[PDB]
Amino acid sequence: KELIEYFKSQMKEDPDMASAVAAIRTLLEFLKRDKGETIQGLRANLTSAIETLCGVDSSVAVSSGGELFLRFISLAYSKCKKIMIERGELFLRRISLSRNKIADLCHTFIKDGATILTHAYSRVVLRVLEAAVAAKKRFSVYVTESQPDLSGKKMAKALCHLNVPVTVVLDAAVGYIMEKADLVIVGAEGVVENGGIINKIGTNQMAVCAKAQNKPFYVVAESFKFVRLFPLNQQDVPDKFKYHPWVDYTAPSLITLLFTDLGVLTPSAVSDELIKLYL
Amino acid sequence: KELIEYFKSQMKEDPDMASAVAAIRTLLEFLKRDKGETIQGLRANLTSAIETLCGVDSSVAVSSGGELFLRFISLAYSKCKKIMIERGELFLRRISLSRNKIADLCHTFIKDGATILTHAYSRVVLRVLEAAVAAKKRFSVYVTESQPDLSGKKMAKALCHLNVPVTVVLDAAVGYIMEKADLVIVGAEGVVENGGIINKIGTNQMAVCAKAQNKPFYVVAESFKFVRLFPLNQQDVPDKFKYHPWVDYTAPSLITLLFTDLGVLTPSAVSDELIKLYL
Amino acid sequence: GSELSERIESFVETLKRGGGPRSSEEMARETLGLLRQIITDHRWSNAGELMELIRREGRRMTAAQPSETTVGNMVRRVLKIIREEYGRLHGHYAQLQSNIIEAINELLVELEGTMENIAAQALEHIHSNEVIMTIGFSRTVEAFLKEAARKRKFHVIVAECAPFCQGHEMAVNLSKAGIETTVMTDAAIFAVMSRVNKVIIGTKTILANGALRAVTGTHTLALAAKHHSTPLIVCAPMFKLSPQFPNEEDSFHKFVAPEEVLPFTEGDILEKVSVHCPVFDYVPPELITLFISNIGGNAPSYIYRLMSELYHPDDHVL
Numbered sequence: 001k002e003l004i005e006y007f008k009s010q011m012k013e014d015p016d017m018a019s020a021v022a023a024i025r026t027l028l029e030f031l032k033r034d035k036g037e038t039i040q041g042l043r044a045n046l047t048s049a050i051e052t053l054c055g056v057d058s059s060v061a062v063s064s065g066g067e068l069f070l071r072f073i074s075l076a077y078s079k080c081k082k083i084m085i086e087r088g089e090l091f092l093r094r095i096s097l098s099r100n101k102i103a104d105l106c107h108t109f110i111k112d113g114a115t116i117l118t119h120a121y122s123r124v125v126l127r128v129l130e131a132a133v134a135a136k137k138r139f140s141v142y143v144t145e146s147q148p149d150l151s152g153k154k155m156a157k158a159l160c161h162l163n164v165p166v167t168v169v170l171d172a173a174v175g176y177i178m179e180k181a182d183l184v185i186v187g188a189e190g191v192v193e194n195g196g197i198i199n200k201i202g203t204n205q206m207a208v209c210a211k212a213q214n215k216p217f218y219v220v221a222e223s224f225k226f227v228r229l230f231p232l233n234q235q236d237v238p239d240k241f242k243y244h245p246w247v248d249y250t251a252p253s254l255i256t257l258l259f260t261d262l263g264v265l266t267p268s269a270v271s272d273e274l275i276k277l278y279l
Numbered sequence: 280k281e282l283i284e285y286f287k288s289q290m291k292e293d294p295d296m297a298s299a300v301a302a303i304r305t306l307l308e309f310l311k312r313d314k315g316e317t318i319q320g321l322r323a324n325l326t327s328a329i330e331t332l333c334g335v336d337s338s339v340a341v342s343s344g345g346e347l348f349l350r351f352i353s354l355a356y357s358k359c360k361k362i363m364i365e366r367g368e369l370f371l372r373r374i375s376l377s378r379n380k381i382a383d384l385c386h387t388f389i390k391d392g393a394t395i396l397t398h399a400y401s402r403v404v405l406r407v408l409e410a411a412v413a414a415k416k417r418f419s420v421y422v423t424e425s426q427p428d429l430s431g432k433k434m435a436k437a438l439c440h441l442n443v444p445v446t447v448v449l450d451a452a453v454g455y456i457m458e459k460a461d462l463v464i465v466g467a468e469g470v471v472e473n474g475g476i477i478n479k480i481g482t483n484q485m486a487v488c489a490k491a492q493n494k495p496f497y498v499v500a501e502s503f504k505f506v507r508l509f510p511l512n513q514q515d516v517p518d519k520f521k522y523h524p525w526v527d528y529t530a531p532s533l534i535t536l537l538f539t540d541l542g543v544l545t546p547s548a549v550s551d552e553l554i555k556l557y558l
Numbered sequence: 559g560s561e562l563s564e565r566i567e568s569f570v571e572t573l574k575r576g577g578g579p580r581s582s583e584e585m586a587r588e589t590l591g592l593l594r595q596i597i598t599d600h601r602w603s604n605a606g607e608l609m610e611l612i613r614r615e616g617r618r619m620t621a622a623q624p625s626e627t628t629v630g631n632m633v634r635r636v637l638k639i640i641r642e643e644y645g646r647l648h649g650h651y652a653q654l655q656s657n658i659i660e661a662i663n664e665l666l667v668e669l670e671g672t673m674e675n676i677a678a679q680a681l682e683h684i685h686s687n688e689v690i691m692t693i694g695f696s697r698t699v700e701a702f703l704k705e706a707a708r709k710r711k712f713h714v715i716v717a718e719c720a721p722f723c724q725g726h727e728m729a730v731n732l733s734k735a736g737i738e739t740t741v742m743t744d745a746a747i748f749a750v751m752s753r754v755n756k757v758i759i760g761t762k763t764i765l766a767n768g769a770l771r772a773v774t775g776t777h778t779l780a781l782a783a784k785h786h787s788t789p790l791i792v793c794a795p796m797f798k799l800s801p802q803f804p805n806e807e808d809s810f811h812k813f814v815a816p817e818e819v820l821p822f823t824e825g826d827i828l829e830k831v832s833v834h835c836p837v838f839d840y841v842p843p844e845l846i847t848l849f850i851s852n853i854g855g856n857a858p859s860y861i862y863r864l865m866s867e868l869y870h871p872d873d874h875v876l
């Protein structure tokens with residue numbers, strides 16, 4: 001098609017780039033290229049782009065982005081699209097400053113001399129740890145190897161360049177090392193209404209062990225990851241996002257705080273943001 | 280030496296044989312071969328055998344066997360050893376009937392139509408599941424892949440021959456599948472005083488998730504695995520038995536019942552047995 | 559001869575059809591008297607044949623009513639007595655029988671003292687102006703409370719048991735002695751639990767795991783007590799101790815006619831709806847704080863040792 005290969009090469013373009021940002025870029029250029037001047041026909045092309053892009057990629061982050069920014073642009077007839085492209089550009093700018101804001105709000109929560117415990121590789125956790133070490137903070141790091149795709153080794157390699165002691169641990173050894181970790185920081189792949197996070201398979205184990213040892217469980221995520229889902233148990237999550245599952249759900253009961261570009265939030269506040277945004 | 284190669288070939292002799300039974304066999308033949316007729320000199324050769332055998336193998340089961348049966352034989356001068364060899368033979372017989380007794384006491388606790396959840400391969404769990412399926416019981420089985428040594432695949436292969444639906448799951452996916460498991464059965468590698476078990480690395484995660492979902496957590500082990508240790512946290516366990524650790528500790532707070540040859544026991548009763556045995 | 563046979567029968571059918579005698583202490587007394595008459599009125603010379611016929615008739619009893627475990631566990635007590643006497647005389651035939659008879663006699667004279675023992679022990683567990691909660695009806699627990707009331711002032715909250723509202727007569731009996739008693743529906747257990755100090759309840763059977771089989775709804779009360787961390791006390795004599803384990807057994811709950819739950823007059827819906835009326839329910843040992851017995855208080859984590867002290871492990875299957 002036209003969006004499949006552009007998304008693929010955007011992944012190739014910037015190996016240091018997220019997937020939701022690539023998705024919003026692809027949908028922006030898709031809407032800017034075809035020149036769809038129709039009140040109702042524009043939405044058809046939009047949802048076609050969204051369904052195609054989360055058919056190629058099974059991320060909840062991509063679908064959440066899609067939904068929220070398609071509503072944002074639709075919330076903006078000839079002048080409609082003329083102002084909608086403006087609002088899309090400024091949305092892209094805000095989403096770009098997202099991760100820097102996230103690092104520079106949450107790097108102050110890591111008391112130095114502590115021990116970070118992290119799940120598989122995530123760009124937001126890496127950014128906040130870079131911000132912390134740039135502020136002259138020394139700490140030890142344990143990383144889960146992320147057995148399905150060995151992203152723990154990748155996280156350890158990326159964090160070793162930051163001049164910090166990183167000790168990638170086994171997937172099932174968090175229960176052993178949880179008493180040696182002062183806190184847990186994990187980058188959510190998607191945030192459900194109640195405050196839970198639909199992250200990699202072992203994040204739920206992380207949170208359960210944290211509640212078993214009262215250890216703080218911190219989560220960092222961009223606000224374009226706020227998805228309007230409410231799973232009651234593991235099976236209640238959409239099966240498309242699970243594909244041996246790949247991504248499981250963690251209740252807000254197990255999360256202490258969320259560090260988003262909208263400031264530090266109680267797991268209770270994300271639902272407030274979502275119902276203010278009205279899906 | 281003489282014990283190293285005999286233990287190795289005993290492992291080669293019977294690939295369907297435990298390590299503690301092989302250790303007791305090797306020590307029995309060691310005491311029966313050298314003909315040590317000394318009140319105090321006999322114990323030197325004994326502890327030499329024990330230290331050698333747990334130097335070659337880093338199992339807590341082997342050391343526990345060693346300790347308990349060296350006390351048993353010492354609890355039995357010319358007639359001393361003459362009756363001690365008798366008591367060793369009957370000890371071997373009891374330890375042989377151990378696993379059959381364990382299967383035939385615990386196979387009745389699996390309500391049919393349930394879902395067993397098991398950690399890495401263990402002979403006792405296999406025996407009890409064989410006893411259950413021989414009693415015309417159908418149930419589903421989830422097995423953890425045991426990432427360090429892929430013993431979950433081995434358990435799945437062994438249990439597939441038993442004509443039961445086995446679904447080996449990921450090491451970090453127990454938190455996802457715990458709601459689909461009616462109970463958890465794991466074969467302990469060693470039983471500490473308070474009732475906890477020093478088993479493979481993910482057994483503690485298993486137990487913590489069980490307490491997170493009130494699911495029954497069952498443990499099956501032979502009484503020669505009763506070790507006289509009391510770890511307060513993960514690091515309190517002996518480091519020699521841990522060798523990236525290999526075996527971690529699970530508190531009796533997280534265990535429902537233990538199925539040993541001495542009958543079904545509350546985690547409280549193992550300490551009673553141990554203090555009656557007086558180490 | 560045939561008197562023994564017809565009395566054994568009468569007892570079997572009384573256990574099968576309804577509850578006779580009502581009090582399970584009287585049931586223990588009756589079954590012990592019957593076991594004595596059996597061991598006296600049979601031509602047994604070796605202890606093995608006696609144990610075998612005892613096991614057979616006990617199997618018949620257990621088949622008569624599985625939910626009534628007092629009869630079975632006291633049959634096991636008699637079997638343990640026979641084993642102990644045989645070990646004493648072998649580790650001797652007329653002396654064997656008379657020694658078994660005097661063993662049964664001491665068991666029976668200590669049987670009627672468990673009530674008074676628990677009543678005496680009751681005082682050191684109740685303080686002034688305390689709020690007790692109990693569910694259903696239990697002679698042992700009401701004796702406990704009315705013996706503590708002679709020297710203490712306290713409040714008792716009795717949760718009626720639906721459908722069999724035995725808790726109402728218990729509340730009346732407690733009020734007889736001036737024990738300020740509040741009667742409520744079992745639906746209000748958790749609502750009132752926040753203002754309760756202790757939970758004192760009887761039981762029908764204690765399992766080897768430490769769990770106990772008690773009237774329906776008591777598991778919810780135990781869960782509420784655990785949530786509010788209030789101590790849950792079980793005043794159960796030592797003849798309700800059953801060596802069987804929770805899920806190695808069969809026939810745990812006793813289901814009675816659903817007429818007690820939904821009446822016949824409801825009409826056509828009674829062909830479309832499935833009604834269930836479980837009398838008993840399972841309470842895991844994690845929710846029990848302390849067991850009170852005729853010997854003294856004990857944690858649930860010692861009931862297995864009490865088993866080892868009462869029943870031979872080869873007689874757990876009868």
Ligand SMILES: O=C(COc1ccc(Cl)cc1)N[C@H]1CC[C@H](NC(=O)COc2ccc(Cl)cc2)CC1
Pocket residue numbers: 687688689713715740750753
């Ligand atoms: O009057 C009642 C009846 O309670 C119920 C009756 C019915 C129901 Cl539905 C629920 C509760 N209970 C009393 C129990 C003592 C309490 N407290 C005191 O008397 C003082 O408590 C203290 C004082 C000092 C200390 Cl250190 C601790 C507690 C007042 C209420």
